[PDB]
C-alpha cells in the first residue's frame, strides 16, 4: 500500500537549481525518515541524506551538504529535495526511499532523471556505414549507421522500416561534447545487399526530425 | 565512512543453478545490513533486511547470511526473472554507504567477436569531420579490448566506446569503436585499422583499409 511517487525528469542548464518531489501515501508520512539517494554508472548508488516529517529535522552525507536540500510538506504528505549550483556531475537519476529502523528501504520511488547540459535541442547528422569497397567474406555483409551530435535522448532506429529484425544491434548512446552519438549494426546475407536497398530510419521526437539514409555501396 | 566492498561486478550462472554475491564492510556492523535488486530502468528492490530476512513477498530461494563483516546473498534455483544486479547496503550508522552492485549474467560457451570495420562517409568528410567505425559482434565472455592504429601507430585521443547489455536471445556481447578525427586529419594519413583481443584467440583479431584505395 505504501507508494511514493516522485516527479517527472528534469532537464537544467548548469548553475540552475531544481526541487523534486516525492509525494507518499499509503502509510503516515509522518512516521518514517525519507532517505534521497542519488545513482550514476560511475559512482553507484550514494546516500545524500535523510529527513524525518516529522519535524523537519535533516541528516546529511558531508559529500552532499551545501548541493542537496531536504523538506517536507507534512500536509500533503510530499517529500522534497532541491539540488543547486548544478553541473554535469549532478546528472543522474535521484530516488527517494522510506526508511526502516531496522528494515532499510522497504519502499522506493520509481526515480526522477535528472541531466544538467550546456547543450541546446539538435537534430542528429545521420550517416552511413557501409563497409570498405562494399566487400564481404562469408555469406553476410555487416552495415551501419552512425547517428552523431544529437540532444537530447533518445532517438528510434529501424532498419528497412522494421523488415529487418533479426542481426540487429544497436548501440547505446555516449554523451560526448554535450551532444549524444549513437550507431547500429545489421548483418544480412550477401545476397541481400548490395542487390537489394538497406535504408536506416531515424526519427528525433525532440527536434521532430525524421531521416531515412539509404547505405549505397562505393568505390574511393 | 563504511565501504561496502562487492568484489564481483559480474558472475555468470545459469537457470537452476545457485549463486552466491560477496559484500564485506570495511568495519563490524552486525546484522544491519540489506541487500536490494535492480533491472535496467527501476528502482531497487528490497530483497534482504537484517543480513538474513527476507522482505514479504520475496521468494524463498533468494537467502543472506553474515554478521559482522562478511556477508552473503545467495539465490537458489536461479530463475531467467533473477538476472539483475544486486546491491548491499549496511544501514547501521551514518554516512549510510552501497556496495558497487554484482551483475547476474547468463553463462554460455565462448563466441570469438565478428569484426567489421568502416570508414568516413562522403557526407561527413563534406560536414567536416571523419568517424571510423569499428563493430565487434556477438562475442563471448564480455570482456575485450579493441586499439586503433593510424599509419601503424597506436591512437588513443578521439576513440569513444559503447557496449550493448548480454543478448537476451543468444547470450553475447557486441562492441562499438568509433575514432573521430578532424577531415584534414584523416586525409593526412593512410592506413586505418581496428585491433580486437578476446579470450577466444591468442593472436589480435586485425581490420584494416587504406584510404582511398580498394
Known amino acids: 500500500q505504501a507508494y511514493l511517487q516522485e516527479s517527472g525528469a528534469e532537464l537544467v542548464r548548469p548553475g540552475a537549481s531544481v526541487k523534486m518531489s516525492c509525494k507518499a501515501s499509503?502509510?503516515?508520512?509522518?512516521?518514517?525518515?525519507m532517505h534521497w539517494v542519488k545513482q550514476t554508472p560511475r559512482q553507484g548508488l550514494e546516500w545524500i541524506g535523510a529527513?524525518?516529517?516529522?519535524?523537519?529535522?535533516?541528516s546529511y552525507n558531508q559529500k552532499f551538504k551545501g548541493k542537496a536540500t531536504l523538506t517536507v510538506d507534512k500536509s500533503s504528505s510530499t517529500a522534497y529535495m532541491q539540488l543547486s549550483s548544478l553541473t554535469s556531475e549532478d546528472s543522474a537519476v535521484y530516488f527517494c526511499a522510506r526508511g526502516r529502523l531496522s528494515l532499510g528501504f522497504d519502499y522506493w520511488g520509481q526515480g526522477s532523471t535528472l541531466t544538467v547540459s550546456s547543450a541546446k535541442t539538435t537534430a542528429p547528422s545521420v550517416y552511413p556505414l557501409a563497409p570498405v569497397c562494399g566487400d564481404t567474406t562469408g555469406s553476410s555483409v555487416t552495415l551501419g549507421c552512425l547517428v552523431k551530435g544529437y540532444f537530447p535522448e533518445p532517438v528510434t532506429l529501424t532498419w528497412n522500416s522494421g523488415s529487418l529484425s533479426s542481426g540487429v544491434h544497436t548501440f547505446p548512446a555516449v554523451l560526448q561534447s554535450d551532444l549524444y552519438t549513437l550507431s547500429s549494426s545489421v548483418t544480412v546475407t550477401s545476397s541481400t545487399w548490395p542487390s537489394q536497398s538497406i535504408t536506416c530510419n531515424v526519427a528525433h521526437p525532440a527536434s521532430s526530425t525524421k531521416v531515412d539514409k539509404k547505405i549505397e555501396p562505393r568505390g574511393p | 565512512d563504511i565501504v561496502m566492498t562487492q568484489s564481483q561486478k559480474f558472475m555468470s550462472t545459469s537457470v537452476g543453478d545457485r549463486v552466491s554475491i560477496s559484500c564485506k564492510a570495511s568495519?563490524?556492523?552486525?546484522?544491519?545490513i540489506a541487500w536490494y535488486q535492480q533491472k535496467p530502468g527501476q528502482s531497487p528492490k528490497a530483497l534482504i533486511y537484517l543480513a538474513s530476512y527476507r522482505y514479504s513477498g520475496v521468494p524463498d530461494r533468494f537467502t543472506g547470511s553474515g554478521s559482522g563483516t562478511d556477508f552473503t546473498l545467495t539465490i537458489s534455483n536461479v530463475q531467467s526473472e533473477d538476472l539483475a544486479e544486486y546491491f548491499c547496503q549496511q544501514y547501521s550508522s551514518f554516512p549510510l554507504t552501497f556496495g558497487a552492485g554484482t551483475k547476474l549474467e547468463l553463462k554460455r560457451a565462448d563466441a570469438a567477436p565478428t569484426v567489421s570495420i568502416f570508414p568516413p562517409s562522403s557526407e561527413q568528410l563534406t560536414s567536416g569531420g571523419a568517424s571510423v567505425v569499428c563493430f565487434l559482434n556477438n562475442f563471448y565472455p564480455k570482456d575485450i579490448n579493441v586499439k586503433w592504429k593510424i599509419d601503424g601507430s597506436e591512437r588513443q585521443n578521439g576513440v569513444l566506446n559503447s557496449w550493448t547489455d548480454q543478448d537476451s536471445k543468444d547470450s553475447t556481447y557486441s562492441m562499438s569503436s568509433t575514432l573521430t578525427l578532424t577531415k584534414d586529419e584523416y586525409e593526412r594519413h593512410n592506413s586505418y585499422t581496428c585491433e580486437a583481443t578476446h579470450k577466444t584467440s591468442t593472436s589480435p583479431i586485425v581490420k584494416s583499409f587504406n584510404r582511398n584505395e580498394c
Open positions: 568495519q563490524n556492523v552486525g546484522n544491519i
Open positions: 499509503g502509510y503516515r508520512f509522518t512516521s518514517y525518515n
Open positions: 529527513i524525518y516529517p516529522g519535524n523537519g529535522d535533516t
